[PDB]
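2.7 Reproducibility. Because tokenized structures are sensitive to small changes in the input, we list the exact sequence used for Glycine cleavage system H protein, including any N-terminal residues retained from the expression construct. No trimming or masking was applied before prediction.
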Amino acid sequence: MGTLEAQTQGPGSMSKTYFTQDHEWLSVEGQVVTVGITDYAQEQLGDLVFIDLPQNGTKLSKGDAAAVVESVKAASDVYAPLDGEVVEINAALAESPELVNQKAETEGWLWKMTVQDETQLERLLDEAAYKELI
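Resulting structure tokens (single pass, no recycling of outputs):
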């Protein structure tokens, strides 16, 4: 699969991004899974005023509420797309929550988590619960 390629990071390798059923995305690079909300989601919410991120070291199960993204008109929980452990959060978002509006699917990522084996993600891709973002 293309997930193997992204995990291996051999020459000419490229990270793969997938979108979920709930306007979230995840990207795989090595064993690091980066998670954010989609461009669609940031547009639904309007200008973001606060981002509440998970604590580093948090053990997540698929579906756990992990973050909150908040505009004046609306708030939205962001759920873990896979089981794993939070290892990094996007420190830019404290001063610049609007980076999520500007670059939702790239620089406005919310957190990074480790997954040791991609069997769960492989299942969700095979089911087309999650789909490749092109």
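The chain has one domain: 1-134.
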